[PDB]
Amino acid sequence: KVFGRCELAAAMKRHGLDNYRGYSLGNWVCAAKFESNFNTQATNRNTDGSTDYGILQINSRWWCNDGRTPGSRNLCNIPCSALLSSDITASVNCAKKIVSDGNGMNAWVAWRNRCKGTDVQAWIRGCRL
Ligand SMILES: [Cl-]
Ligand code: NA
User: How many angstroms does the Cα of residue 55 sit away from the middle of ligand 2?
Assistant: First the structure.
């Protein structure tokens, strides 16, 4: 499913992401936009053989199991395919674990290079939340 800007904003807020670990909703919507262009089905292969899945492009090297990433962990205890659903519950729950890992949202490369330091509030502007 391809989410609308405000539609996703509302969905994330309901799932407890607004201000989670100090990160305002705008940060999460910005990351989603640049990681997957709001597409829950987005998949991207990495050089090391791992693959990124879903709306927030979670990596199979450490967070989910896709059966084709040798020596990987699966810290979120879930099939990577579950991160491609129209329902973002699985992605959100796993992202909460990731952002709490120690490096915050820097774990998401696109957020660091395109969201960090910007006026992220612009991403939820005009939204009925
Ligand atoms: Cl943190
Ligand atoms: Na894995």
Answer: 18
